Amino acid sequence: VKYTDAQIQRLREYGNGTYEQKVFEDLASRDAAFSKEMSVASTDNEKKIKGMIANPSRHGLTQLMNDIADALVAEGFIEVRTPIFISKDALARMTITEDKPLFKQVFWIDEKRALRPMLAPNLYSVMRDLRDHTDGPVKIFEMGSCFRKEMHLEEFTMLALGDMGPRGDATEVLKNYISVVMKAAGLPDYDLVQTIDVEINGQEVCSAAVGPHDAAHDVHEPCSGAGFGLERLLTIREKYSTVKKGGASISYLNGAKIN
Amino acid sequence: GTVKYTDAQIQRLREYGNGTYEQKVFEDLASRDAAFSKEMSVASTDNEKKIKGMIANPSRHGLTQLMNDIADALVAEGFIEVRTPIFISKDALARMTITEDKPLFKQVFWIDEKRALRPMLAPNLYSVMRDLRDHTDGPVKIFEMGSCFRKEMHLEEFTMLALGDMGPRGDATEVLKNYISVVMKAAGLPDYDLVQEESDVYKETIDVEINGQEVCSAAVGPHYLDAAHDVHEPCSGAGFGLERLLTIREKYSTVKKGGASISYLNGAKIN
Numbered sequence: 001v002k003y004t005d006a007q008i009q010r011l012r013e014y015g016n017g018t019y020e021q022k023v024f025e026d027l028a029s030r031d032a033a034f035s036k037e038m039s040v041a042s043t044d045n046e047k048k049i050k051g052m053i054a055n056p057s058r059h060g061l062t063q064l065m066n067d068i069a070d071a072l073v074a075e076g077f078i079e080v081r082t083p084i085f086i087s088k089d090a091l092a093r094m095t096i097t098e099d100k101p102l103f104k105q106v107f108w109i110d111e112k113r114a115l116r117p118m119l120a121p122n123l124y125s126v127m128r129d130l131r132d133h134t135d136g137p138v139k140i141f142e143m144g145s146c147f148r149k150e151m152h153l154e155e156f157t158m159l160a161l162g163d164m165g166p167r168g169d170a171t172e173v174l175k176n177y178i179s180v181v182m183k184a185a186g187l188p189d190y191d192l193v194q195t196i197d198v199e200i201n202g203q204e205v206c207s208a209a210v211g212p213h214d215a216a217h218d219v220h221e222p223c224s225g226a227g228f229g230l231e232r233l234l235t236i237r238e239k240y241s242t243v244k245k246g247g248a249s250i251s252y253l254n255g256a257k258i259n
Numbered sequence: 260g261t262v263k264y265t266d267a268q269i270q271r272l273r274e275y276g277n278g279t280y281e282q283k284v285f286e287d288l289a290s291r292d293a294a295f296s297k298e299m300s301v302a303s304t305d306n307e308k309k310i311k312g313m314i315a316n317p318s319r320h321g322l323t324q325l326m327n328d329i330a331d332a333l334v335a336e337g338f339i340e341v342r343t344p345i346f347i348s349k350d351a352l353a354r355m356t357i358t359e360d361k362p363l364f365k366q367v368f369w370i371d372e373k374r375a376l377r378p379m380l381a382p383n384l385y386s387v388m389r390d391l392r393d394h395t396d397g398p399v400k401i402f403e404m405g406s407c408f409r410k411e412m413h414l415e416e417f418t419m420l421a422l423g424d425m426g427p428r429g430d431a432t433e434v435l436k437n438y439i440s441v442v443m444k445a446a447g448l449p450d451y452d453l454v455q456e457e458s459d460v461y462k463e464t465i466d467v468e469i470n471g472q473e474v475c476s477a478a479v480g481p482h483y484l485d486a487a488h489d490v491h492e493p494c495s496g497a498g499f500g501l502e503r504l505l506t507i508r509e510k511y512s513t514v515k516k517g518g519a520s521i522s523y524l525n526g527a528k529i530n
C-alpha cells in the first residue's frame with residue numbers, strides 16, 4: 001500500500017517530508033506509519049514556529065530576493081520597481097489579446113486596467129527609455145508580485161531581468177545571467193530546455209528568450225530577458241511539500257503552518 | 260514682489276526638477292517667466308546628470324534600500340518579518356469597520372464581489388499576530404512591507420510598512436513610541452513630531468509628522484477593534500508610508516518619483 005490521497009494531503013498540511021514515495025505491506029502498517037509521521041510533522045512544525053518567534057529573521061522570500069538582487073547588481077544590473085497596474089493597451093502590445101489563453105487569466109481592475117500577469121511590459125518600457133540616455137547596453141531587473149486567475153498561486157513573485165542593446169553571443173550571455181541567478185538562489189543544478197526554459201527535475205522555474213521583438217517601432221534594439229518564479233525556487237530549495245508555504249500567506253510563515 | 264510661478268509652471272518645473280519652486284516670488288510676469296525659462300533648463304540638466312550616474316553605477320532601488328534598512332533594524336529588535344497576500348476579503352474589511360457607508364470603503368479596489376486589493380496591512384497582520392499568540396506567552400512583534408491600494412502626497416499604489424506589537428512588556432504607548440523611533444532613525448529621518456489626530460477606524464491616532472506632513476499613523480487598540488480580531492490584551496501598531504519617507508529624505512518635489520514607476524527612477528524622470 002501507499003499513503004492514501006487524503007493521507008498525503010493531511011501529512012503535507014503541517015509536514016514538509018516526501019510522503020508520496022512511501023510503500024507499505026498492509027493497511028495496518030500504512031496506518032501505523034501515518035500516525036507516526038503525522039505526529040512528527042505536527043511537533044516539528046510547532047518547534048519551528050517557536051524558533052521564529054524566539055529568533056526572528058528576515059522573511060525567507062525577502063532573503064531570496066536580496067540574495068539574487070545583490071548578485072545581479074554586482075553583474076551591472078540596475079534594479080527597478082514598476083507599478084502593479086498595467087493598461088489593456090500594454091497587454092495588447094504584449095500580444096495578450098482577447099483570444100490568447102493568458103488574457104482569460106487577467107484580473108481586471110476597471111475597463112482599461114489590470115493587475116500585471118508578468119513584468120515584461122513594464123521592464124521593456126523602462127529599458128527602452130534608459131537606452132535613450134546612453135550609448136551602451138542597459139541591464140535591469142525587477143522583483144515583484146504578478147497575478148493570474150488559477151505550483152500555481154494567484155499571486156506570485158516574479159524576478160524579471162533584461163539586457164537591451166549591442167551584445168555579442170546573446171545566447172551565451174543570457175545563459176550566464178541564468179547561471180548568476182540560479183547560483184545566487186542556492187540552486188546550482190538545473191536543466192536548460194527548449195527561447196530557453198529552466199527546469200529542476202522536470203519542473204519549470206524560468207522562461208527566457210532572445211529577441212522578443214515592440215510593434216510601435218519598425219527598428220528594434222537587440223534584447224534578451226528571463227523570468228523566474230521565486231516561490232517555486234524557494235519551495236524547491238527548502239523542500240517544502242507545497243508551493244503555498246514559503247511566500248505570502250496568512251496560514252504559513254517560512255514553511256510552517258501558524259494555525 | 261507678490262508674483263509666484265503659476266500652478267502650471269510649478270508642475271512643469273517639478274516634472275524634471277527637485278527644487279523648491281513654490282517659494283519663489285517675483286516683481287512681475289516678465290521676471291517670473293524669465294526665471295521659469297532658466298530654471299526649466301537647470302532642472303532638465305540636473306535630471307540628465309542623475310540618470311547618467313545611475314547608468315554608470317548600477318544600484319539597488321532607493322525604495323528597496325529603504326525597506327532593507329528599516330527591516331534590518333526591526334529584526335535586530337526581535338520583530339518577525341511577514342509577507343501576506345495583497346488580496347483580502349470583504350469580511351476582513353468589515354472587521355476593520357470599513358463598511359459600505361465609510362469613506363475608505365469608497366476607495367477600495369474590488370477584484371470580485373468578495374475580494375479586494377488591501378488598502379492597509381492591518382487586516383492580515385491582525386490575523387497573523389493572533390495566530391502567533393497561540394505559540395508564545397511573550398510579546399508578539401511582527402511587521403510587513405508591501406503594496407497597498409486606494410482610489411485617489413497620494414499614490415494609488417503605495418508601500419506601507421506596518422508593525423504590530425501584542426502583549427508588550429511595559430506601557431503600550433511608550434513601547435509604540437520607541438518602535439516609531441527605531442523606524443524613523445533607521446530611515447534616516449531622526450527629526451519628527453508626534454501629533455494626536457482623529458481617526459474613523461482608530462478613534463484617535465498618534466501620527467508622525469515632518470514639517471506638518473503625515474508619514475505614519477499609529478494607535479493602541481482601540482479595544483473594539485482588537486476584540487473584533489479576537490485580541491484581548493494590550494496591542495498597538497503603526498503604518499508608515501515608505502514613499503512619503505523617501506520623498507522627504509531625498510527632497511524630491513513630488514511623491515511619484517521615489518517608488519514604483521515607468522516614468523521615474525530614483526528621483527529622475529527617464530522619459
Ligand SMILES: [N]C1=N[C]=NC2=C1N=[C]N2[C]1O[C]([C]OP([O])(=O)(OP([O])(=O)OP([O])([O])=O)/O=C(\[O])[C]([N+])[C]C2=[C][C]=C3[N]C4=C([C]=[C][C]=[C]4)C(=O)C3=[C]2)[C]([O])[C]1[O]
Nearest residue numbers: 379381384413414417421423474475476478496497498500
Ligand atoms: N494614497 C497614499 N499614498 C501614499 N502613502 C499613503 C497613502 N495613503 C496612506 N499612505 C501612508 O500610509 C500611512 C498609514 O495610512 P493611513 O493612516 O490610513 O493614511 P491616511 O490617514 O488616510 O492618510 P492621509 O495622508 O490621506 O491623511 O493609516 C492606516 O491605514 C493605519 N492602518 C496605520 C495603522 C495604525 C495602527 C495600526 N495598528 C495595528 C496594525 C496591525 C496589527 C495590530 C495593530 C496596523 O497595521 C496599524 C496600522 C499614512 O500615514 C501615509 O504615510
Ligand SMILES: Nc1ncnc2c1ncn2[C@@H]1O[C@H](COP(=O)(O)OP(=O)(O)OP(=O)(O)O)[C@@H](O)[C@H]1O
Nearest residue numbers: 148151152153154156204205206207227228229232
Ligand atoms: N501562477 C503562478 N504561480 C507561481 N509561479 C508562476 C505562476 N505563473 C508563472 N509563474 C512563474 O513565472 C515564470 C514566468 O514564466 P511564464 O509567465 O511563461 O509562465 P507559464 O508558462 O504560465 O508557466 P506554467 O506552465 O508553469 O504555468 C514561470 O517560469 C513560473 O516560474
Ligand SMILES: [Mg+2]
Nearest residue numbers: 102105148152
Ligand atoms: Mg501558466
Ligand SMILES: [Mg+2]
Nearest residue numbers: 197204206207
Ligand atoms: Mg513559461
Ligand SMILES: [Mg+2]
Nearest residue numbers: 363366409413
Ligand atoms: Mg487617506
Ligand SMILES: [Mg+2]
Nearest residue numbers: 456466473476
Ligand atoms: Mg490622515
Ligand SMILES: [Mg+2]
Nearest residue numbers: 464473475476
Ligand atoms: Mg493616517
